[PDB]
Subunit: 359 residues, 4 copies
């Protein structure tokens, strides 16, 4: 169990940006700029800085050229400069390695703290950032698939309850989770900004980064991303979806960047900002929990995720999950899922929904 520090937690506003290491900067630029339409704040031979349509901070995504594709940092904005000091004290009390740079790790961010958190994830906390032109009414630029905000991160970690307690002490509130009747937690979603999540924990070998999520205004904007991928004959890069989630109630799509970093496109979840927001627990065997329409979850969604780096830039060692596997208990050989609790009709035994089995 990760103890609660005596030192006060930093006041975290929201997820703010991710820095992803990519192997071919021009290929990655083609995906995030030419395909997905993100807006360039700055670029050079080594990095691309990108932001969503409604953002006013410098960026929501930094692509950094390097030898091994991986998550380098997931960054959260805090409420005041002083909260960066609070973060440093808090993580030092937790016995974590930290690095502080008064003028930032990446361009357009000022005083910043990066940490190897207790789950092995590279987190950044910052307040100071270069404001840029907020493009929210630049409909002369607006794409039919426009990504309007950064919404969340999702992390793969072997022990979800351990992680959940640590994030709750840091001030995230769990909005939804997936459990079974035998005490296992498979996933949890938790927020600061009053949406279903700012980060989330998915049970699996880790630390690895499951995805970064961007939102659109409307469901048709997500449809258009699919449509455009078809027209560009890159439909093999659509991993899963589009769908309606059970957890979050958002309309969703998962796609894969050139280094296989998974990106979610997301819209129309609900308000969670009240402190007694009802926490929703879904049973892992409920076949509407991930896709509300019952569509099967592709096995790569459960097995594949991005490497993460330590503060030296080396890949973090993976620790195997020993708790039960969501894949195995739902769509694997001894798996089970239901449409209606207690009804054999519309249940699935040892395979996925809708007539499919694991490849």
């Amino acid at each position: 169990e990760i103890p609660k520090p005596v030192a006060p937690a930093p006041d975290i506003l929201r997820c703010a940006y991710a820095e992803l290491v990519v192997t071919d900067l021009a290929k990655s630029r083609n995906f995030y700029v030419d395909v997905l339409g993100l807006h360039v704040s700055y670029e050079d031979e080594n990095q691309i800085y990108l932001r969503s349509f409604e953002e006013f901070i410098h960026h929501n995504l930094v692509l950094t050229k390097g030898p091994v594709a991986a998550l380098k940092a997931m960054a959260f904005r805090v409420r005041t400069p002083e909260d960066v000091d609070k973060a440093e004290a808090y993580y030092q009390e937790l016995g974590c390695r930290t690095e502080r740079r008064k003028d930032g790790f990446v361009k357009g961010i000022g005083d910043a703290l990066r940490v190897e958190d207790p789950l092995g994830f590279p987190y950044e906390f910052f307040f100071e950032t270069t404001h840029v032109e907020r493009l929210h009414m630049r409909y002369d630029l607006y794409s039919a698939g426009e990504l309007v905000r950064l919404d969340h991160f999702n992390q793969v970690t072997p022990d979800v309850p351990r992680g959940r307690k640590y994030l709750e002490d840091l001030g995230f509130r769990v909005t939804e989770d997936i459990q079974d009747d035998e005490g296992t937690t498979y996933a949890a979603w938790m927020h600061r900004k009053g949406t279903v999540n700012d980060t989330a924990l998915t049970g699996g070998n880790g630390p690895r980064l499951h995805h970064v999520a961007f939102s659109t205004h409307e469901k048709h904007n997500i449809i258009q991303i699919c449509d455009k991928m078809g027209a560009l004959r890159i439909s093999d890069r659509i991993e899963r979806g589009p769908g309606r989630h059970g957890v979050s109630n958002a309309f969703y799509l998962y796609i894969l960047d050139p280094d296989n970093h998974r990106i979610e496109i997301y819209t129309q979840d609900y308000y969670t900002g009240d402190p007694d927001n009802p926490t929703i627990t879904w049973n892992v065997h409920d076949n509407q929990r991930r896709d509300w329409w019952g569509n099967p979850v592709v096995p790569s969604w459960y097995t594949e995720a991005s490497k993460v780096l330590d503060l030296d830039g080396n890949v973090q060692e993976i620790i195997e999950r020993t708790d039960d596997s969501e894949l195995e208990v739902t769509i694997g050989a001894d798996g089970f899922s239901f449409t209606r609790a207690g009804d054999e009709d519309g249940s699935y035994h040892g395979q996925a929904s809708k007539g499919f089995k694991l490849g």
Copy 2:
């Protein structure tokens, strides 16, 4: 081969309605009225007559209680009363069984001809019909999933070129089809009303009815039908979709009624009314042909379809397809499909796309 009659073809306007035999009338009413929101023109203990939001003719769907669920008639409206006489002469010259009723087979239809056509299907031709209130501006009734028009039928038949040639002589024009490089045809779509199709042929054991399709205004209306089915905890009756089709370019969904009759919800195909409208042929191995986003086609879509009746109400004997099976050549153990023609990346061998094999 089906010869072209000397007698002139009737001038067919459009698909108009289907008569489906259903086993439990109240359960079918719950599906078509309470779930899907179709509008009742007439009903009693034996039949329910249903129409779409923008229709002015008496009905688009007749549910007839009977012992064996099946298609009893697929009905086309012709341009004038005299075209019914033309249909009679045309099918008599073909040597088909016909039955003429001056006062109709179903309520709200007048003089009508039913035939057991050369492919074994019960076709109706009629002009006269009782007009009803056209509900197209009744936004006090409009549902979030509103079905606005009847769009088309789709028929399963073993020999597609044989059926296509016969429908062309009837005045239907091919818009799109699916072939392989060695001369096999798997499917064809053909129209009278200037959309992608009024009826279509799917290669398979037949005669069977693959589906009846209704339109919505917008893509979100289709999404709502899925969302409603999830809320009603009947997501197991969502067979396939939602998606974007390759062929037709329509946004789509397939669902199953209580007797397993398949209903397609469909929107935003293109205009085909010019006589040199460009035909489009897709290769059967192109994994964007059916779902443009590359999502796998569930095997039941290829295997399952409704019985059809002869004019005595008995089930038509099925004739087996001898040409290659689309299922087998694409997603079966020796199947294959591609994302980009000639590229092994994004190709699938012996399984479906996205990581699934056949269940």
Copy 3:
């Protein structure tokens, strides 16, 4: 009355394109290409040829540089090559001036007949056209405001019944109209292709071209056009809408090009292909007939429209409507409209809504 020819009418498929004369080609190009996103089929220093997303014929719009902005031709595609000969015989019998060019008037059209029709409008009939890449699945090109098809034309003419009967003889069927209890017709919509309209008649001084209409897939695509015009700070070129029409039930928007040619963006009207399609007549005083939500129709919509050219390229003289004016009877000083017939609550007198 325009008598019906004994010569058979050409079989008209649909409205196909318009040729608009524009005064500043580059400014017009910025509007139709950079603002509206139409696709270039051909251009040079004198003309731009444009098409919609789902089109396979060469173009839906030809912009031709000239001294005086006007409609030069409104073109209808006919079913066969022989229908061009039929059109020529038909209009000759009508006593109209005609001009046949076996190699076309504009690029990408072959054998074509232009006429000064009995209402003073320059109509073209053609079959042959150069096919181009149908862009209907080119979602790499698709705009948030994408114009997907050419839908219809709308003509201003002084005597709507006279024009209506002429168009009915040509095979157009009336789908909707606006009348009053006195028996005056203010407007009528008529089709060949099985939508509410291919060419409509608006009562007013004419011949003038009221608008050309393009369709989108969805209502949000129309919203986006408005939003883009705001961002470009050209919201003054949004004339009327967005709204829901009563007549047609379509979602709509009217905007003005750099020469004040009016373009409608339009979506989601209904199927009219059956020959007994029920005709809908609205009362001119019904405040939901034009905008279903009861928003007022600004006077410029009734009074302003494009000049049209004769076959020499000179502007056609205008004939003043003598029938009652829809503007005057609804929003002028003695006009009125209602929300509910017979209810003074929600009625407007001498005054728009």
Copy 4:
């Protein structure tokens, strides 16, 4: 000027509900339930408690039968039970009349403080509320016009800067405002929950309630409300819109209930939760500031607004605005607006846009 208390401000989460006095409970029910589709949490012969599709607290709207239609309370939920104590101390230091009830003023709310605030408005602060079934995935109930959240209130008050300072001290942050080149402020928007507003101030004679706003998921849902109103032949109850706002960037519609209470339908504004969120100031003569498409703002939108009650249920006396009137300066006889700053073309003198 309203002084800043020594006492700490309550931590306000969001706007939560309004109580509206209505004169005919059945006609109001028909508007809010049958036309607009709001969900009944509770009703009896005196009151209807309504909530939006995604709400879990007891209600977002209380309709209370009474002799004079008016706003009775605009309620904000606070973060903790202790914040209701803080609210009470804060308003007492401001010298405002307060009333606290441990068991609530309306059903489904527990310990609650109502105040007559420094601008004459009846504010409620509460934490405790009865949770109900959150209908957010009840797509079996979902309307083509579904109202999904309560978004904000908008208040008419004669002196905007005076009010703005008071709300900022309470912890609201200004997101957008409208000013001119002569030192006048015409409107301001301010939030707690990280949207463009939870309440807003519109310069005018007051206290009056300008509107209550509810959100939809998508723009077509707003369109459907207009289409349904046409089908019901009540299009005369559509006041303004639908449109795109300049301020807030939201898609919008304004309609009128049977007592003329104005309801906004609203979707797709932007995130404001960062404390240095950039504040946007529009010029009052910019004809894209209220409707981005330059559609004219009807004079009733400026002149008409609901009465508000004091804690005894009596109508608050209206104080006249002496600052310049947005109506007069933009669409009055001597008004002016522009499409492009400094461009005569697309400008309007002494009349509204679009003819």
